[PDB]
């Protein structure tokens, strides 16, 4: 034989073993999730440990295969991933310290709490009441104090841990050949070895900056409109032309502006699409919702769910002594097994979440025969975009009218459509500039350009300059404001959602164009469009065997991410915001400070 044959046989053996081992680990984790017992915990821990040990030993053995004698361009990528993912370069003490830091961060974030002053008799965690207080309470002073207390009790105690973690990550990057930890994170989208499709790790920063610059007018118009609306509620606490406080965003972290939709609704008198009432009146249960979702997936040409999925996916929680997590998740165990774990209720939001999970499962079902190492998408945002486009297509009123839950006599006009577009904007675009700002801040903290003793000062400068939101109460270097977020606490890439939005909007526009859809873009459906389904399935089967640029071009015909679909989807909303902001100043004033 030759080196190529040896590598192919080794990869096949590793894939066959890893499929079974990962299936066992995922099955144990699913048993723990749907049946929380000590034995299930022990089994899941043992399965995960054995899977990790198998990955480590396989990666260690794979280091004997050079990457300069492969002409398949698929075996080489798999071997490189095996060598770089399951193997370790840091010393034992460094890895132990990093794992200890991660465990401490997870424990402190999971059980974080703060409560009323001068009364430690009773206190509540962030999840039970603090989110409810931030999303429902209208008291400016209490919300400001709660935000300040949470930041003080999180960042002050997380600053040493975050510093140690980032120093260890910088040490790991120094041991590596990449520029820094942020460079390593950006290298996920890097494509090499192909002429005409090569990519660079540093291009992502410039692309994200360009997209943010393009989206700047829409976001600044939205911020000006929100400030003008809030001026009628908190005129003294909010400057008429200044920056909104960070604790008036409807949530602790200020990620999403959806919680303020009810307070600042442009038109509260227009009728709303209430499918929950029709679902309740017509006895629409979880079984019927799942059947309708399967029917919709069949209509777009995707194959129906089989008996294995139905008997493996839980629908409703058994309850009583049995307790399970209600976080909606989709399971990809391999071996032709896929499960959905979610607590489902009769709401439109739960319908959208169910469509999201079903789209993710269908995406996971598109590489059943592909190798285990190739059973994944080229880009981390493609999976989320595929999961979300089905929900976006189902969320349109056309499908609701077709099913019959929406009244056939319902009408659509300027006001309702503008309100829907503004709700979608507050849901999606409300975090995209925040996403860019936080990803850039993580890039700087990983690279180390910003001095550590100036980390907080640069964070405040970025918040006052790019975000356009002024801090109600400042913090010195003793605090760590970003550490209060889940993504920063678990050290996850904070660019997935920004790319996912563009990918899903490009896919939606391309499928609407392929479906010969007519009328405004935001009222489009692909329920009876099989050409769009075939175009999507062309990208679905590619997986990691093809570059992400080629996969995107096969659907939308673009060599890079574009925000033009996003801008076009909200063009009437942009015009309405421009018309409304005639007498409202647009921009952020850095000199002004609420704290004198």
């Amino acid at each position: 034989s030759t080196i190529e044959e040896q590598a192919k046989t080794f990869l096949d053996k590793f894939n066959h073993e890893a499929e079974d081992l990962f299936y066992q680990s995922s099955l144990a984790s699913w048993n723990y999730n749907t049946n929380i017992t000590e034995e299930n915990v022990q089994n899941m821990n043992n399965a995960g440990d054995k899977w990790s040990a198998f990955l480590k030993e396989q990666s260690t053995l794979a280091q004997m295969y050079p990457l300069q004698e492969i002409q398949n361009l698929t075996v080489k990528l798999q071997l490189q991933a095996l060598q770089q993912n399951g193997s370790s370069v840091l010393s034992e003490d460094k890895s132990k310290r990093l794992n200890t830091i991660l465990n401490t961060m997870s424990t402190i974030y999971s059980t974080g709490k703060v409560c009323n002053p001068d009364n430690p008799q009773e206190c509540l965690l962030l999840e039970p009441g603090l989110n409810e207080i931030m999303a429902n309470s209208l008291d400016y002073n209490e919300r400001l104090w709660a935000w300040e207390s949470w930041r003080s009790e999180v960042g002050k105690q997380l600053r040493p841990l975050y510093e140690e973690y980032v120093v260890l990550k910088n040490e790991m990057a120094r041991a590596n050949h990449y520029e820094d930890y942020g460079d390593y994170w950006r290298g996920d989208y890097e494509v090499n070895g192909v002429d005409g499709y090569d990519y660079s790790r540093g291009q992502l920063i410039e692309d994200v900056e360009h997209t943010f610059e393009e989206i700047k007018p829409l976001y600044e118009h939205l911020h000006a409109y929100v400030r003008a609306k809030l001026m009628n509620a908190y005129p003294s606490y909010i400057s008429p032309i200044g920056c909104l406080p960070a604790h008036l965003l409807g949530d602790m972290w200020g990620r999403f502006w959806t919680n303020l939709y009810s307070l600042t609704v442009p038109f509260g008198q227009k009728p709303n699409i209430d499918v929950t009432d029709a679902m309740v009146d017509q006895a629409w249960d979880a079984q019927r919702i799942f059947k309708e979702a399967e029917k919709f997936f069949v209509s777009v040409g995707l194959p129906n769910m089989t008996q294995g999925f139905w008997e493996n996916s839980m629908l409703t929680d058994p309850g009583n002594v049995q307790k399970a997590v209600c976080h909606p998740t989709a399971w990809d165990l391999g071996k032709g097994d896929f499960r959905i774990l979610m607590c489902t209720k009769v709401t439109m939001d739960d319908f959208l979440t169910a469509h999201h999970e079903m789209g993710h499962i269908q995406y996971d079902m598109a590489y059943a025969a592909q190798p285990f190492l190739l059973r994944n998408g080229a880009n981390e945002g493609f999976h989320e975009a595929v999961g979300e486009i089905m929900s976006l297509s189902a969320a349109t009123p056309k499908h609701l009218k077709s099913i019959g839950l929406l009244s056939p006599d319902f009408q659509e006009d300027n006001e309702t459509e503008i309100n829907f577009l503004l709700k979608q904007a507050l849901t999606i675009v409300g975090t995209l500039p925040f996403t860019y700002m936080l990803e850039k801040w993580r890039w700087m903290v990983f690279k180390g350009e910003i001095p550590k003793d100036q980390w907080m000062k640069k964070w405040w400068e970025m918040k006052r300059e790019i975000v356009g939101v002024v801090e109600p109460v400042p913090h010195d270097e003793t605090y760590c404001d970003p550490a209060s977020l889940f993504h920063v606490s678990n050290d996850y890439s904070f660019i997935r959602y920004y790319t996912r939005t563009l990918y899903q909007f490009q896919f939606q526009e391309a499928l609407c164009q392929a479906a010969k859809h007519e009328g405004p873009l935001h009222k489009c459906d692909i329920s009876n469009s099989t050409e769009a389904g075939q175009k999507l399935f062309n990208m679905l089967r590619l997986g990691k065997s093809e570059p992400w640029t080629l996969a995107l071009e096969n659907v939308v015909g673009a060599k890079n991410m574009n925000v033009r679909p996003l801008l076009n989807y909200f063009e009437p909303l942009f015009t309405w915001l421009k018309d409304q902001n005639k007498n409202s100043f647009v921009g952020w004033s850095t000199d002004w400070s609420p704290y004198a």
Partner: protein, 49 residues
């Protein structure tokens, strides 16, 4: 490839690489492998008479 009416069953050491793997070592596996017929398993691991 086999021959008509064959009963080849052997968990012997497969010659996967170029080296004469008469014993054991790296890139040395076995051709015959366990199936694992599971009722939960669907396509690829289902019994057929």
């Amino acid at each position: 490839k086999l021959k008509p009416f064959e009963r080849d069953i052997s968990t012997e050491i497969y010659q996967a690489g170029n080296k004469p793997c008469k014993g054991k070592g790296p890139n040395c596996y076995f051709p015959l492998q366990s199936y694992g017929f599971r009722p939960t398993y669907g396509v690829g691991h289902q019994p057929y008479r």
